[PDB]
Amino acid sequence: MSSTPSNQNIIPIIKKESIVSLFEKGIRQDGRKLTDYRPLSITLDYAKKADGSALVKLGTTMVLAGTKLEIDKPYEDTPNQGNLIVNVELLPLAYETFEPGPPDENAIELARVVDRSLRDSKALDLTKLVIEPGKSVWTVWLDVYVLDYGGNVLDACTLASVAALYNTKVYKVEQISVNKNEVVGKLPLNYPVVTISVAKVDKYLVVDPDLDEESIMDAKISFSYTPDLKIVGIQKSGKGSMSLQDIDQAENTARSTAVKLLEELKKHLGI
Amino acid sequence: MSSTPSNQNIIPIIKKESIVSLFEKGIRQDGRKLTDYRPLSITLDYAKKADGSALVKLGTTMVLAGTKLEIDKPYEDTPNQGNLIVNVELLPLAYETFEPGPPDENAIELARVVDRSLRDSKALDLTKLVIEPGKSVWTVWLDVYVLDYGGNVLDACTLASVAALYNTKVYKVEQISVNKNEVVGKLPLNYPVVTISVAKVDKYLVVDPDLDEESIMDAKISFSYTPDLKIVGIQKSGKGSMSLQDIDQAENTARSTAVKLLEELKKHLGI
Amino acid sequence: MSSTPSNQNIIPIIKKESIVSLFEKGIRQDGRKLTDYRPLSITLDYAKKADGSALVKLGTTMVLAGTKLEIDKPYEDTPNQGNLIVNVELLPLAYETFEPGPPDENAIELARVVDRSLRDSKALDLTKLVIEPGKSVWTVWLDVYVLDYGGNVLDACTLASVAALYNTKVYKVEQISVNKNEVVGKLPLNYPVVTISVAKVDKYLVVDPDLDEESIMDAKISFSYTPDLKIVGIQKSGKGSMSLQDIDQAENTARSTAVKLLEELKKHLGI
Amino acid sequence: ERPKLILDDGKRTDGRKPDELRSIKIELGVLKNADGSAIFEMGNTKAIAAVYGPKEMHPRHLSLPDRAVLRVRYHMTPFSTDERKNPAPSRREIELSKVIREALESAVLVELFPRTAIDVFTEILQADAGSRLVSLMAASLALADAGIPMRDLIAGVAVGKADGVIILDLNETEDMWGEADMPIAMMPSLNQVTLFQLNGSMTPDEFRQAFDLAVKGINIIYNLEREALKSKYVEFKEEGV
Amino acid sequence: REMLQVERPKLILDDGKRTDGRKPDELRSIKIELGVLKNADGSAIFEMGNTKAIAAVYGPKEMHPRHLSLPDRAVLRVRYHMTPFSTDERKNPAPSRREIELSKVIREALESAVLVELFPRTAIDVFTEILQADAGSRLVSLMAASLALADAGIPMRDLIAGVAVGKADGVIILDLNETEDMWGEADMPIAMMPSLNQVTLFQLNGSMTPDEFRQAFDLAVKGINIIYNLEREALKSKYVEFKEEGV
Amino acid sequence: ERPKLILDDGKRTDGRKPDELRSIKIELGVLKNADGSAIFEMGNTKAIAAVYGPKEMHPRHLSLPDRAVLRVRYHMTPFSTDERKNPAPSRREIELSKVIREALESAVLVELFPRTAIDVFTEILQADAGSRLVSLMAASLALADAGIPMRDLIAGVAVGKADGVIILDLNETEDMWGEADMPIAMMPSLNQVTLFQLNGSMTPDEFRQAFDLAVKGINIIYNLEREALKSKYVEFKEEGV
Numbered sequence A, B, C: 001m002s003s004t005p006s007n008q009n010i011i012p013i014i015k016k017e018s019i020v021s022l023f024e025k026g027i028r029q030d031g032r033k034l035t036d037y038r039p040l041s042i043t044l045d046y047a048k049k050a051d052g053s054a055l056v057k058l059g060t061t062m063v064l065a066g067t068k069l070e071i072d073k074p075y076e077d078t079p080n081q082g083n084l085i086v087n088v089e090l091l092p093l094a095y096e097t098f099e100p101g102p103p104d105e106n107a108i109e110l111a112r113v114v115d116r117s118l119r120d121s122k123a124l125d126l127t128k129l130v131i132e133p134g135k136s137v138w139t140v141w142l143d144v145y146v147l148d149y150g151g152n153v154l155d156a157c158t159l160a161s162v163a164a165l166y167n168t169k170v171y172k173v174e175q176i177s178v179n180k181n182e183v184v185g186k187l188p189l190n191y192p193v194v195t196i197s198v199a200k201v202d203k204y205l206v207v208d209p210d211l212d213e214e215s216i217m218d219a220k221i222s223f224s225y226t227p228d229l230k231i232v233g234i235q236k237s238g239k240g241s242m243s244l245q246d247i248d249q250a251e252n253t254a255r256s257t258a259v260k261l262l263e264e265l266k267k268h269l270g271i
Numbered sequence D, F: 001e002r003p004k005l006i007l008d009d010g011k012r013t014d015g016r017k018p019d020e021l022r023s024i025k026i027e028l029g030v031l032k033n034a035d036g037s038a039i040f041e042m043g044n045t046k047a048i049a050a051v052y053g054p055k056e057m058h059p060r061h062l063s064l065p066d067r068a069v070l071r072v073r074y075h076m077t078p079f080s081t082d083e084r085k086n087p088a089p090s091r092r093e094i095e096l097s098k099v100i101r102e103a104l105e106s107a108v109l110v111e112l113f114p115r116t117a118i119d120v121f122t123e124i125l126q127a128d129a130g131s132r133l134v135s136l137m138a139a140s141l142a143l144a145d146a147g148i149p150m151r152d153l154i155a156g157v158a159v160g161k162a163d164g165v166i167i168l169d170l171n172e173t174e175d176m177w178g179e180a181d182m183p184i185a186m187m188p189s190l191n192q193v194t195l196f197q198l199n200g201s202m203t204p205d206e207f208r209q210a211f212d213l214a215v216k217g218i219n220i221i222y223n224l225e226r227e228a229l230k231s232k233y234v235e236f237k238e239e240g241v
Numbered sequence E: 001r002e003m004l005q006v007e008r009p010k011l012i013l014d015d016g017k018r019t020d021g022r023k024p025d026e027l028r029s030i031k032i033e034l035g036v037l038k039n040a041d042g043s044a045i046f047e048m049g050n051t052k053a054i055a056a057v058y059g060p061k062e063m064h065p066r067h068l069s070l071p072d073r074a075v076l077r078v079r080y081h082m083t084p085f086s087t088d089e090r091k092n093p094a095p096s097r098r099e100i101e102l103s104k105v106i107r108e109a110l111e112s113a114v115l116v117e118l119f120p121r122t123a124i125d126v127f128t129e130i131l132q133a134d135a136g137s138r139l140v141s142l143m144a145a146s147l148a149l150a151d152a153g154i155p156m157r158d159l160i161a162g163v164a165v166g167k168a169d170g171v172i173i174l175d176l177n178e179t180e181d182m183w184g185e186a187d188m189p190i191a192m193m194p195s196l197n198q199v200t201l202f203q204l205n206g207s208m209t210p211d212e213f214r215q216a217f218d219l220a221v222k223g224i225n226i227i228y229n230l231e232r233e234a235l236k237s238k239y240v241e242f243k244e245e246g247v
């Protein structure tokens, strides 16, 4: 059963206006324009014992994503596909008020949202992960851990995920057994994917909301893009609502940002 | 661990005597005699995506039971039988003081009680659900959902269950796969079964207690009957106790009511 | 997640000095010396439906351990070994501050500690439990139930366990099926093992702390010994700390006690 | 194999044109014990919602000082689908519950009832795609039936892309094989989007087209909701937008 | 229609006698002892034949979760549980549906005896463990509890006594076997406050004609009364042993 | 074949002498949102700890009247090991959390903060034996970073017996195949043992030898901890005690 969060911070009336009055001048607290992204750092192969890993810092948000490959019989439903299991965890260490031990509501929501934009975009080609058709396929465990909650966690997960996958090493397949030091190649990835979150605060729209900005927003909406700018996932979020034209502009903005972010993601990954 | 329900409505001393004073004149609040049943409605094949379904209204109580058939290897213990898995659920739509999330003390008890009177009566012949002996049998999932708590839920479950089963459609068995639009026949049912609950309030016995009547009763006792009037299950229930002669009469009454109820159930089912 | 026990019996400042003032004279409340063990009773084959069982009374502590043998495929990891499974039940029955529901961090700790001193000591030879190598082995379920919490539960579990195993009857193996009334022999046991717990209270060290003594101790440390006095497991326990020389003497004491306890355990088991 | 989603004549698998709603059936106050109840049916998707009106909270500290706490539950009965859905809640079921709760939080005037919890319980009796929207609307009406004041009623459709054709109100089949499935919910009078999700693929254009169509659908539904409120019972044979 | 014979074993054998050599109206060997656990406020071990249960009681105390208490009553917390080595094949420790239902049935049974009004805001813990199961485990458990409560000095209306009564090979029999529970037509646990002639627990699984029901019922009482006397005795002398005997 | 641990001039599998520590790397205040944070690395075991400073308890009755309640969690990320560790906590993970909590309870001055909970969260990012000690030390430093007053910092090593040779700071490999694995943690300034465990087999003598060696190791580590406190960042290339 889902219920209104009692614990998430009720940020005073006064503080909200301060931020809005700045928005009115097209600037924010940290200094960036309404459509700007926070500084982005990506450190690849961070967790050494992962198959592929990525440490992402988007502003003060920190996410560590790591992959782990396993050989399984494919699901009886989908006999010609490898499996993908995305797993967001919101470990308390992220924020001043969290519960630990395997994920809750938002952790699950984050995972499914990241899942759907990897799967539905065929950014990762699951049909290319088949070893013995119907008998054995690769299972790609994606485990995404949020270490520091800086706001706009979704976008940072998408990034950490895409990065971890691109970092992933496939191994030699001894015919029966895996061999974990003869590296065969890389994951069958068609292209990277970015998720861009736009927050509606008051009457303004804001790209990549920070912690404060999130706590005062009416709602946020997230758009997943493939490199050629096909929309590949959308998620409205938050207890407030949003007008029709709000959403229209939101996507407009989300998209012309997507280009910039995608280039920068590629630079971290190496084209 | 089991513990005294705290949640429940402690119904005042005064209200009880109002009801008892009426019982003394052989009448109840709703108008019926001490041995009468509430009005009964049964709508068959209610949930369309079930194999068989039944919506039962006994007074203000509402139960929707639905069957779902599956092919399984039979229990290693019982290699010549199909399986019956009952599941009663007290969803919180039922009543004010109700539990969300998978079934509790009361619910489990309801399921097992319903189970035992179907299984021990051989009302449903499990030996007649074998496809390949020892290799594959039918598993009959009965799922009983209580939507409106009007009191005396047990009897309405028995009814909704028996009805759902009689509504159940068996399918063609392609030898390996099920074919869900060539209907082969019906479930191997020997006869219907009814459960009659008698509540001891004060010194009186009352058939089919309603919500008020349940909250003031000392205890209730439930009798399951096959059409031939063989007792096929008994369950005492409630915080209080009951004398020897109380039980004697309870069964006497329960039985000469069973006949009437059975005749009415059959009308809904078409004999 | 692990947290400081809130139901933890905060035994007053005053009561502590009564006990310490006695320790200063080298005596305790019950009368025994600082290095003495509480009276020990063992009743073998107590639970009749167990393969082997032992009821142990160490002071007012009661533990009932029972074994149950099963035939399983060995773990793909360890293909030439029978399996050992120690479960532990701090039965709510034992103390007034004991929640029910499958093992808590305390009950698990006891199990793993008992496990490690049976397994790492090769007191029970797991390689000697193989039926058909790689295909089928014996799984030894050890289930230890604490019935009365008299303090120093760990030692009494070690004892109950060792006793239960020595009481264990192996059965005839019909080649496919077990035959539970042709007794083939006994468990492949190399030797018994004892665990001795030494509690640091104030500046004193105390062997086999009772309930009061446990509630006032800084910490306790437990040593597992094989018959010719090889240390085979160590566990520090408690919210407080212990000096280097404390530990040194602790083990010294633990060991010259181990001899006496082992001789007494053997008497109960019969040579 | 893949079934063809738009047949040679321009009609879908159930014989609807790209712009036609499925048969809608609504009724209120169907449960005695709930404070408010509603059954909603779009085509073969059948949901029932019960509301338990503003009451204080059993766990004291979990309440809210100025707000009602919404407690929402989306759940699929084991016999709502072609193969027995497991009763124990799935990740899908959990996400949906949140998405729905949030949706309702934007409509319900939760400030009016501090320290109080409002329970909204939802059961899918038959799933045929857009189960989450039928659920949400059932809830919205059950809340209205409960006399709980909201900003507006909530109305919604799944809109999608079939064989490159943008279509209104999806099938089980259409959800399964089409390029895109995009549930949208509104407070239509306020022109406010309450729930918005897309899974699948769309060009910004297609996105905006499907969006325009979703509105036209929502408006027709919203009128039936108004009607259901007045007369307690509404039926609607399928019609073009 | 050749040389065909039934696979289910005969339950009423030579003379009146059952599989364990008892006549239809004979109780299994009973053994009771109180105050066996140091740390409990009240304790009891009860044995009927090979069914052997232990019950511990934790006397009237306030509730850790404040709002879960009752304003005028004690809250009974009861637990029926089977140790993994109580049966012929390892019973799983984690509680079964059977175990859950039985806990409720037993709790309710006790709620009718214990004077819970005397202790508002307080919880009374009753913990029960089956050490060997041989049918009627729930009754051995309930009685163990009743006595453990009495041992705890908690005032009740009466002690609770109970037997499983059943139908074997069409013969009505008293106090069932593991074997008789399985193969017989009917198994009917019944518990009483015998002095008050009050039924506390009542269940039937299986099949019976109203007549058979009433016969079995009469027999159950006769059994219960003999047991009830041993309970009284166990209270006074803390220890009771009873070699099997006909009603 | 059981691998050979001590080779033909007594160096170990990673080329260390019996008395050499693995490479240590410490850094504090690495997390923005925590009240105190630390990353600790010994060889290939890396842990991260976050602390959430003294705050009141959400469940009122669970607090302590004169003490802070320590809430500790040891957890291994699914990609910390050679084969995906399951995220849901194991029995091993549970015991360790307790063993660690108790360890910390002897250092932290919990009396100073009645009614308050201090949260200590720990994550193993790579496991290479002695994960529990790296975890504990990370915690100890994260607590210190949080400005929470303790009696002393906690330092620890796993000491063991390899091919009958007593060795300091164990490998993944050495933990596996060696006769003994004995984690030991200290408040070195107070000469106080905080955590102490042995799994495996040892003669009282060997026990006492390993013990002496563990101290010498702990002291070197303790110095780096002091250093990490002052300069917020410490690196240490392996060498002999």
Ligand SMILES: Nc1ncnc2c1ncn2[C@@H]1O[C@H](COP(=O)(O)O[C@H]2[C@@H](O)[C@H](n3cnc4c(N)ncnc43)O[C@@H]2COP(=O)(O)O[C@H]2[C@@H](O)[C@H](n3cnc4c(N)ncnc43)O[C@@H]2COP(=O)(O)O[C@H]2[C@@H](O)[C@H](n3cnc4c(N)ncnc43)O[C@@H]2COP(=O)(O)O)[C@@H](O)[C@H]1O
Pocket: A075, A077, A078, A083, A084, A085, A086, A112, A115, A119, D081, D082, D083, D085, D090, D091, D092, D127, D128, D129, D130, D131, D172, D175, D176, D181
């Ligand atoms: N349960 C159920 N029964 C019957 N009909 C059902 C239904 N759920 C939906 N429907 C039908 O669909 C409509 C409309 O709803 P929706 O828009 O969501 O449409 C669904 C539906 O068409 C189809 N689908 C998914 N699961 C189905 C089942 N069981 N039965 C029938 N159809 C099913 O996919 C659409 C999108 O689903 P979702 O939003 O959940 O996204 C999924 C999906 O893309 C994929 N996934 C997961 N499980 C799948 C199965 N069984 N089949 C196909 N695809 C499946 O992963 C996404 C999220 O999965 P998640 O649960 O978060 O994580 C799982 C998953 O990654 C993996 N797992 C498990 N089983 C599988 C299979 N078979 N294949 C791939 N991966 C799998 O394990 C992860 C860990 O979870 P754990 O298992 O440990 O709990 C409704 O009205 C109705 O008509």
Ligand SMILES: Nc1ncnc2c1ncn2[C@@H]1O[C@H](COP(=O)(O)O[C@H]2[C@@H](O)[C@H](n3cnc4c(N)ncnc43)O[C@@H]2COP(=O)(O)O[C@H]2[C@@H](O)[C@H](n3cnc4c(N)ncnc43)O[C@@H]2COP(=O)(O)O[C@H]2[C@@H](O)[C@H](n3cnc4c(N)ncnc43)O[C@@H]2COP(=O)(O)O)[C@@H](O)[C@H]1O
Pocket: C075, C077, C078, C083, C084, C085, C086, C111, C112, C115, C116, F081, F082, F083, F085, F086, F090, F091, F092, F127, F128, F129, F130, F131, F172, F175, F176, F181, F199
């Ligand atoms: N999870 C994990 N993956 C990979 N590497 C891991 C790791 N955890 C640690 N490490 C690596 O080892 C070093 C140092 O570790 P440690 O100091 O703990 O030394 C351990 C470790 O080396 C090894 N071990 C334990 N688990 C391991 C896994 N998964 N992989 C590799 N090695 C593993 O055993 C040493 C001592 O272990 P412990 O004190 O925990 O006692 C265990 C152990 O001896 C044995 N056991 C349990 N699980 C085992 C696996 N997977 N493989 C081999 N042996 C394993 O049983 C003892 C008791 O376990 P417990 O959980 O209390 O109870 C279980 C057990 O009785 C039985 N069970 C379940 N599965 C198995 C297997 N596979 N084999 C035997 N018995 C088994 O069932 C009981 C009931 O619980 P249920 O399983 O039903 O949940 C780290 O730093 C890192 O580098």
Ligand SMILES: [Cl-]
Pocket: D129, D130, D131, D132, D133
């Ligand atoms: Cl849907």
Ligand SMILES: [Cl-]
Pocket: E135, E136, E137, E138, E139
């Ligand atoms: Cl029983």
Ligand SMILES: [Cl-]
Pocket: F129, F130, F131, F132
């Ligand atoms: Cl470790």
